[PDB]
Design a protein around this nucleic acid. Structure first.
Length: 50
RNA sequence: UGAAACUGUCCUUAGUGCAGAUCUUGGUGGUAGUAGCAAAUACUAAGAAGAGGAAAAAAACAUCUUAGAACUGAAGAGGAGA
């Protein structure tokens, strides 16, 4: 569970959803140790749903 | 180094000696990898093509298709003329 409110608190509005993608990519790099991260289309569409 | 013309003495002649003219023309520095590359709301994921996203996050990746999210808002960032 990624508590994304922690990362995006008091963030610039027009960079909220794009930064949500960046933070998830960072968490995959620091956990699976792989630099090649591929997002499912369902995950990207959920981030931008709002 | 350079590869085909040149020098010394005597007279003669002159477009004959440069550090300056905010001198003319051409070239080049320090400033300096500095000031900047900030109006027009905004981009994201998957795939293709390509030498052109690599990597101890080098956090950014131009074009095209699809999906999401958007703007001009119909006296328009539309379709047409002088």
């Amino acid at each position: 569970t990624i508590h994304m409110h922690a990362y995006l608190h008091k963030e610039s509005f027009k960079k909220r959803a794009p930064k949500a993608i960046k933070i998830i990519r960072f968490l995959a790099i620091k956990t699976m140790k792989t630099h090649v991260v591929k997002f499912d289309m369902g995950l990207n569409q959920f981030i931008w749903s709002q």
